[PDB]
């Protein structure tokens, strides 16, 4: 037999409430939601709406099911269609350099789709803003919600949008007949995080009943191998999950009943 052993979580993930929201956020005030303690289908996200971008830097859409993560993070905002490229690792410009920067080692998916139908207004939608000027670049996942006037000259400037200084925020403006490059686009960045802690988010792979004293194919919280598992009088810190040695996985921690089981080939 083969065993795959996942935590006993019985909650679905709040993904349909991040994509089907009414008013998304501005790229400078991009919203973040935490996803923890839930089983994620990732099926109502691969087929939710006709998508312009579903680029999964890092893990691959075939593999997210049967992977377990510690925390998932759904970032949400709305940018211009030309700027969906800038939501990617290692990119330069305005949106990535001053509004929303991703790390060179990013892991997760970037989804992006057209919202001209419900984010554009004939009179003009001035509810969405972007930061044009910042005194410095952004680190991965930083956020500058400031609204202070910025001066580029040696002369001071405070509380007035006079010459040599300029307000930092700029309104997009979304009229239904804008070019497709300049039309609204809603972006949801799913970012997955593995850490030295229990796995809270896990794909819908049903846990199997545990079997020791036999040579099985094991899959614990996603980490896979082969061998026989035997009850282990070893013990490591709580919130620790594996027994790397000399980098094999000597021992594992059972997600459901936190017993340490040693792996031997």
């Amino acid at each position, epitope marked *: 037999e083969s065993i795959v052993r996942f935590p006993n979580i019985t909650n679905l993930c709040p993904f349909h409430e991040v994509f089907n929201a009414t008013t998304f956020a501005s790229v400078y005030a991009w919203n973040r939601k935490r996803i923890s303690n839930c089983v994620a289908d990732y099926s109502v996200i691969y087929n939710f709406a006709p998508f312009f971008a579903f680029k999964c830097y890092g893990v691959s859409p075939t593999k997210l099911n049967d992977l377990c993560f510690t925390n998932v993070y759904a970032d949400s905002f709305v940018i211009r269609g030309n700027e969906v490229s800038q939501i990617a690792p290692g990119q330069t410009g305005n949106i990535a350099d001053y509004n929303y920067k991703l790390p060179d080692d990013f892991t997760g998916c970037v989804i992006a789709w057209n919202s001209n139908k419900l984010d554009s207004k004939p009179s003009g939608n001035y509810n969405y803003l972007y930061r044009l000027f910042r005194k410095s670049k952004l680190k991965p996942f930083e956020r500058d919600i400031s609204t202070e006037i910025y001066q580029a000259g040696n002369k001071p400037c405070n509380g007035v949008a006079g010459p040599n200084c300029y307000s930092p925020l700029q309104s997009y403006g979304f009229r239904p007949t804008y070019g497709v490059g300049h039309q609204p686009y809603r972006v949801v960045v799913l970012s997955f995080e593995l850490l030295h802690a229990p796995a809270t988010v896990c794909g819908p792979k049903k846990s199997t009943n545990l079997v020791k004293n036999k040579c099985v194919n094991f899959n614990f919280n996603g980490l896979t191998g082969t061998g026989v598992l*035997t009850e*282990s009088n*070893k*013990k490591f*810190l709580p919130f620790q999950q594996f027994g790397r040695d000399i980098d094999t996985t000597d021992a594992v921690r059972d997600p459901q009943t936190l017993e340490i089981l*040693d792996i*031997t080939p």
Partner: antibody
Amino acid sequence: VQLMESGGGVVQPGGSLRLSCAASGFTFGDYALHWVRQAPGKGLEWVSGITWTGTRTYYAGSVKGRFTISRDNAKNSLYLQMTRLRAEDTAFYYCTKDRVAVGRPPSFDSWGQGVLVTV
Amino acid sequence: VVFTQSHSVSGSPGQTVTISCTRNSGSIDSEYVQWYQQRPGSAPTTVIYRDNQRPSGVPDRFSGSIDSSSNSASLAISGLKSEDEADYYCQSADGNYNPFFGGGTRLTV
């Protein structure tokens, strides 16, 4: 549970000896086995241990590469074999069971009556 | 690398007694602590086969404490009958999973 031994007796410096512990009352191949010696009047000291199947061997420092340990689930037996043993090896050897098949950090569960070894 | 404890402990029938070992360089409760009873001239017997646990037959009197902030482990008697005087040893692991014992503590009713 019985863990009888055999092989007690004197030896000389740079000598050699072999101890052979039996077993009873439990499934023998499911558990690990260790050797723990007690110098007369002094405290216990771990010697060497092997796992349930038998593919790995872990030694102490004083016994780094001077002895060796094996087993046999057929004869229900555990063996130690010491060579070049110095005067600092005179002890009272106990062949000990575990509660675990691997037992790299050991947890001794049942012990044997012991076997004296001089030099 | 060392698990220092005391060399002897007094006592009296009907009372409780406590034996304390101390891990000198290493965090206690990293690994488990085992407590063995060796009477003079007999093979040992495991009294506490984890930080707290008791085997099937070891009397209800014995108890174990893994108390953290002292970096010490402590075995408590809680009822002192006739057959209770022996050298009690404590052992643990050192991360490299080599085991290491204490020095022994003799109880004398």
